[PDB]
């Protein structure tokens, strides 16, 4: 709201360990294969399944409520297996959002309730708008905005994304405290 990030008070129940905060409400079925190296946030009722995964997330990663990050299955003639996805640094997944994406780049703002397709690659410094469908096996270049049910180039982003996005994710993390 007018550049400034607003207050969000968390409850007592949340798994805070080595900077990484993960809501107890949010199930993450397969805790072994999933890894959170940095000071990540995972909001309540969110899913990070371990269906033969290697879900590596960023330094300041944010996943809002009711949102799912599942790896896609690669339809290979040699052997059909689930491809391990790698969420980049400073990644912001918005609320109620579906992600079946392989290799999500750093410094990205994925919009609200937007379905990303199977085996979908996202390069760094991009932005997917809300109520948008990226089809299976699609690529989005840097400094781009993809939107619509087709999921196609809408326009370009501001030049200063790399520097700006840092402030957003770090401010949200700092502003997001217990009550």
């Amino acid at each position: 709201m007018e550049l400034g990030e607003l207050l969000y008070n968390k409850s007592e129940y949340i798994e805070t360990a080595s900077g990484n905060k993960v809501s107890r409400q949010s199930v993450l079925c397969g805790s072994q294969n999933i890894v959170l190296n940095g000071k990540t946030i995972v909001m309540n009722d969110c899913i990070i399944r371990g269906d033969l995964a290697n879900v590596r997330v960023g330094r300041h990663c944010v996943v809002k409520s009711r949102s799912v990050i599942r790896p896609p299955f690669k339809k290979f003639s040699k052997g059909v297996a689930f491809f391990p996805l790698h969420i980049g640094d400073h990644v912001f997944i918005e609320e109620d959002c579906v992600v079946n994406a392989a290799q999500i780049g750093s410094y990205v703002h994925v919009g609200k309730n937007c379905v990303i397709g199977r085996r979908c690659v996202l390069k760094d410094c991009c932005k997917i708008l809300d109520n948008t469908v990226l089809p299976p096996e699609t690529v989005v270049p840097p400094f781009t905005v993809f939107s619509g049910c087709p999921g196609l180039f809408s326009g370009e982003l501001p030049e200063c994304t790399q520097e700006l996005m840092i402030d957003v994710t770090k401010s949200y993390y700092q502003k997001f405290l217990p009550l």
Partner: protein, 167 residues
Amino acid sequence: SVKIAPGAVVCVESEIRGDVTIGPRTVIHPKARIIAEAGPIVIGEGNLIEEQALIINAHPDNITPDAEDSEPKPMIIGTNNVFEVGCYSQAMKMGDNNVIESKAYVGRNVILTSGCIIGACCNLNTFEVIPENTVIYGADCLRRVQTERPQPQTLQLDFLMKILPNY
């Protein structure tokens, strides 16, 4: 009131309610919401369910007319059927060889045939039988297109047999 079948890798951690009737080779993913409110949920072999998938038989909650005498409305589902991420479903009769896409709201009385796909993030409340081997794409408009051949998804289901153990 549960009719669990061997071979089917239904995960215990997924939520189930009512007079369920489980299929031979079905594979239910965790946090898959199946309810048998009025009539039973009949499941065909190879009918895998992925992530959030609201399958209810609550026509008594939807309308509540107090008509059709008993009105069981038993939820029949076919074989080799992929339920994707966040797709709402409520179909009394549903055919074999059909794949609803992610966040697809299927209607209160919509009958699915073979080789037929619902569009991702597309909602269809209107009651209308789907033609043989035709796909719907987009939310803004339906834009129906007839497919050349039906698409099978057997290999995917078969591999989950190996994964689900110790999860």
